[PDB]
Paper text:
[name] is an intracellular protein encoded by the [name] gene of VACV. It belongs to the [name] (Bric-a-brac, Tramtrack, and Broad complex)-Kelch protein family, which are substrate adaptor proteins specific for the [name] ([name])-RING (Really Interesting New Gene)–based E3 ubiquitin ligase (C3RL) complex. The N-terminal region of these proteins contains a [name] domain that mediates dimerization and binding to [name], a three-box helical bundle region, and a BACK (for [name] and C-terminal Kelch) domain that is likely responsible for correctly orienting the C terminus. In this study, we showed that [name] binds directly to [name] and solved the crystal structure of a complex between [name]–NTD and the [name]-BACK (BB) domain of [name].
To promote crystallization, A55BB was subjected to surface entropy reduction by reductive methylation before being purified in complex with Cul3NΔ22. To understand the molecular basis of this tight interaction, the crystal structure of the A55BB/Cul3NΔ22 complex was determined using anisotropic diffraction data extending to 2.3 Å (with an observation/parameter ratio equivalent to that of an isotropic 2.8 Å resolution structure). The structure of the A55BB(M)/Cul3NΔ22 complex contains one copy of each molecule in the crystallographic asymmetric unit. Consistent with the SEC-MALS analysis, a heterotetramer of A55BB(M)/Cul3NΔ22 can be observed by applying crystallographic 2-fold symmetry. A55BB dimerization is mediated by the [name] domain, where the N-terminal helix (α1) forms a domain-swapped interaction with the symmetry-related molecule. A55BB consists of a globular [name] domain (residues 1–118; helices α1–α6 and strands β2–β4) followed by a helix–turn–helix three-box region (residues 119–149; helices α7–α8) and an all-helical BACK domain (residues 150–196, helices α9–α12). The [name]-binding interface of [name]–NTD is formed primarily of residues in helices α2 and α5, with extra contacts from the α1–α2 loop and from the C terminus of α3. Residues at the [name]-binding interface of A55BB are primarily found in the [name] domain with additional contacts in the three-box region; the BACK domain does not contribute to the interaction. However, compared with other [name]/[name]–NTD structures, the A55BB/[name] interface has more hydrogen bonds and a reduced contribution from hydrophobic interactions. Residue Ile-48 of [name] is adjacent to the φ residue Phe-54 and, like Phe-54, the side chain of Ile-48 extends into a hydrophobic cleft on the [name] surface.
Author numbering:
A (entry chain B), D (entry chain B): 24 to 328, 344 to 381
B (entry chain A), C (entry chain A): 1 to 196
The structure:
């Protein structure tokens, strides 16, 4: 067959051009001439040879050259070399889509296949970013930088920002790559840090100081997400901070001797008691624990007694510190109905 | 208020005057003067051409001699404030040029006109056209319009132009509007008589 | 179909990207990059500027430091696919710049907004404005709105800014909405008390 | 007054600029700077000084320079010098309107006065084109060229075309200047030529040859209008051709001995009789004269006679030559009712 040798020859012309774009030699390439060869290929029902061929050329470049350049930089400027490889791939794929535009508008549209841009993202994801050693090193580098910053060290936030935005784009208008490769081990590492930091604060600080320190960590983790990561990570990290520091120590915080809720009710620390209400409202069974400890103290004081002095004091705590919550209101009202039952 | 239609009229006025014209299109011996920015906005071919990434990016002359002049001229008029005067005879050539230059605004207007005015006398010609220019959208529609007017088209003038492979595709299975379940060999006889 | 609104959106996309930009507007320290053809189509100032008849015709930089930046920037956005977000505070400055640059599309949209939203609290300010910028259309309308709200405006904050010549023009003959035929000297007293 | 000396000084800057445009020295003029001076002048209610001043500067240029250049070319290339003066004025006024654009959009709009373009046309019309000696010479040159072309000479049609299009534009979207200065003496001169040419053809040609010669002159005068003059002159000239050659000789043409209508009815010249019908239908009382002469011959032939041979012959003339006209039909039918009355 003439065309079996002719179409293989017209492809070699386009194959050489794509390879020239990969070498950044696009400067001396003719768009007009190269577009006609791709235009004639699609019209003569030979788009299969062009599409399958494109995949094989891009795969060749990302395995033999791009993957090796990243693997030979694992110890010196890893994130910088990987980001440069990512930017070079994006610049190449745009100009590859530029010359093969007729295939990107006619062939991929009616045959229902991935476009030049999406095809490039899949090969760069599977052969470079998600490749064994690179995938592990990217995870270990990003997690160490966050762990160092939490200790009080200065890290390249921009390098973390670029690596996270790269993982988001490689998910093909999704967060599947960013979640699996970065978010999941990040929340697992963070939970281990927040639990160890919780144990420190419960032994070297007061209950009032603890609540303010948790709020400081909530606002610190929001800043890290907004400046270094994707803003979709804001809710999952805050929930980890809330679980490890509040939820796992709810009864402990309120039962702190000469510092907890009972101590705050005695001394009448209005603004300080309000801080506990603002933090415990974030977690489930938080305000329930505050009510149970309050009812335990209120019932004992009313038992000891006259009663109009207690109701006036607890109404002041309800409106100012507990923001007139219906759960706290029925707890106070329920305890005063119990004192009338006694006599 | 929207003054987009008023602005394009002044730009088209500058185009005729020769004002701000920084590009010329050459088709054999004919010349059309336009603006680089305007052509890049509607047609993605010119957008990729004047992208400063190729040797042809920084030029004043573009040679498109392989395309129809009246088709290219009317398409530039369509890019500007002039509406496309679509007719059954020119739409065949305007769609081909619009497909090459990849103008979304013109490719839709041409396809919609072809699908709307797809008569029994037209479908026979539009099928062979879509089979050459790989337009599966019109290729399927013209095929359906041929199958519903099969016995009227066997005596038609354009019936001789239909290929052997196309005849097999038509008679292949079903959907062909034939009241008698024995018209299929008679259709083959009429094709062998028209093509000889 | 009309694709004029679609085309201008791609041109505005090229403007933000920096594509085909062959002109820059300088206002003190701020810079706005645009296209020579687009600015000439809506504004007749740029059309006469880039006419190849003057020394300033063949240049890349235009200095308009005597005009308001946010006004010029929004007017260029109006020339492109962005609609003008008109408010009582900025319309005063957008009309002045549109009058200088002579953009018909923007001068009408601003005048129509001023005439529509000409309240008792606004008319007092729009009269002194039109008296400075020689806009007889708004000058007559603001004068009529002042005369119909005269007794409400004598106690208003902006009453002190009205000139001696303007006070004579108001009290001059008739049309001033005063139920009692002896309010005229009392209006003069309130002006002499507010201006001192 | 400071401004009485300041505004007079800012005007001198604009006055010098307008004079530079008139000398074609616009190349080294700054639009940006000149526009501000005109902008400040209109805003400060000093547009009167700018408008009155503009009129005086344009008037100075067209009287002292332009008028003198035309008057010094009356014998050598008059139309060429006048057309150049017209083109130079148009080019100057556009650039004058360009720098004084703010006055042309604000001052003339609200004060209801003529724009820069229209003001220039009035001064060029009154001081150059309609000026005594130039106005007479333009009329004498244009009329001589048409009179020469009618004799069989070759004249510059383009020079006539440019001079006529100039007179049309100077009428301010009207034909008042073209009508008074050119059309009126043109129709007066033409009528004198057509009447003398009519006298020649009536003595050296046949009635049939005359009708075809008038049609030739109608088509010749239409060509002259379409190629050298304004197309609004098509109807007035055709009416002059029709009046001088047909209307003034209606009875003469039909009463021509051995050539007229009576001769055509005898010989049965069907297509030749149809030519007379086509020409006489243009003028009032034309077909009426044809009917009166036909009825005079038909009544005498029916009087001499049998009658079925005359009705058959006249029905053939009615349908083929007279295009089944109702006036000719009632004339034939009326004459045959008269023959029945005789006996």
């Amino acid at each position: 067959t003439m065309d079996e040798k002719y179409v293989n020859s017209i492809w070699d012309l386009l194959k050489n051009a794509i390879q020239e774009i990969q070498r950044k030699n696009n400067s001396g390439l003719s768009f007009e001439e190269l577009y006609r060869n791709a235009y004639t290929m699609v019209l003569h029902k030979h788009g299969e040879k062009l599409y399958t061929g494109l995949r094989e050329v891009v795969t060749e470049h990302l395995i033999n050259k791009v993957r090796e350049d990243v693997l030979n930089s694992l110890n010196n400027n890893f994130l910088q070399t990987l980001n440069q490889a990512w930017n070079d791939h994006q610049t190449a794929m745009v100009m590859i889509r530029d010359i093969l535009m007729y295939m990107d508008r006619v062939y991929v549209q009616q045959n229902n296949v991935e476009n030049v841009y999406n095809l490039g993202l899949i090969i760069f994801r599977d052969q470079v970013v998600r490749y064994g050693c690179i995938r592990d090193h990217l995870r270990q580098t990003l997690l160490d930088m966050i762990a160092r910053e939490r200790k009080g060290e200065v890290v390249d936030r921009g390098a973390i920002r670029n690596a996270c935005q790269m993982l988001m784009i490689l998910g093909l208008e999704g967060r599947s790559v960013y979640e699996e490769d970065f978010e999941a081990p990040f929340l697992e590492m963070s939970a281990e840090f927040f639990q160890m930091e919780s144990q420190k604060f419960l032994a070297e600080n007061s209950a009032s100081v603890y609540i303010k320190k948790v709020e400081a960590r909530i606002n610190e983790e929001i800043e890290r997400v907004m400046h270094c990561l994707d803003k979709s990570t804001e809710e999952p990290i805050v929930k980890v901070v809330e679980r490890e520091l509040i939820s796992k120590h709810m009864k402990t915080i309120v039962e702190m001797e000469n510092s907890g809720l009972v101590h705050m009710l005695k001394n009448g620390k209005t603004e300080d008691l309000g801080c506990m209400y603002k933090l415990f409202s974030r977690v489930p069974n938080g305000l329930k624990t505050m009510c149970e400890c309050m009812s335990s103290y209120l019932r004992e004081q009313g038992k000891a007694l006259g009663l109009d002095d207690l109701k006036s004091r607890f109404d002041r705590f309800l409106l100012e510190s507990f923001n007139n919550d219906r759960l706290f209101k029925q707890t106070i009202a329920g305890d005063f109905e119990y004192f009338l039952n006694l006599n | 208020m929207n003054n987009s239609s008023e602005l394009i009229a002044v730009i088209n006025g500058f185009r005729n005057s020769g004002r701000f014209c920084d590009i010329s299109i050459v088709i054999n011996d004919e010349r059309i003067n336009a603006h680089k920015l305007i052509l890049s906005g509607a047609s993605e071919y010119f957008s990729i051409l004047f992208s400063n990434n190729f040797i042809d990016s920084n030029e004043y002359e573009v040679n498109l001699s392989h395309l129809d002049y009246q088709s290219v001229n009317d398409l530039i008029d369509y890019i500007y404030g002039i509406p496309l005067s679509l007719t059954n005879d020119n739409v065949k050539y305007i769609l081909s040029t619009a497909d090459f230059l990849q103008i979304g605004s013109a490719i839709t207007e041409c396809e919609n006109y072809i699908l709307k005015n797809l008569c029994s006398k037209n479908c026979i010609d539009f099928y062979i056209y879509a089979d050459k220019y790989n337009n599966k959208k019109i290729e399927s529609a013209s095929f359906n319009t041929i199958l519903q007017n099969i016995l009227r088209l066997i005596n038609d003038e354009n019936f001789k132009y239909l290929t052997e492979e196309s005849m097999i595709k038509i008679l292949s299975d079903d959907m062909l509007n034939i009241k008698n379940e024995d018209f299929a060999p008679l259709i083959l006889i009429k094709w062998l008589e028209s093509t000889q």
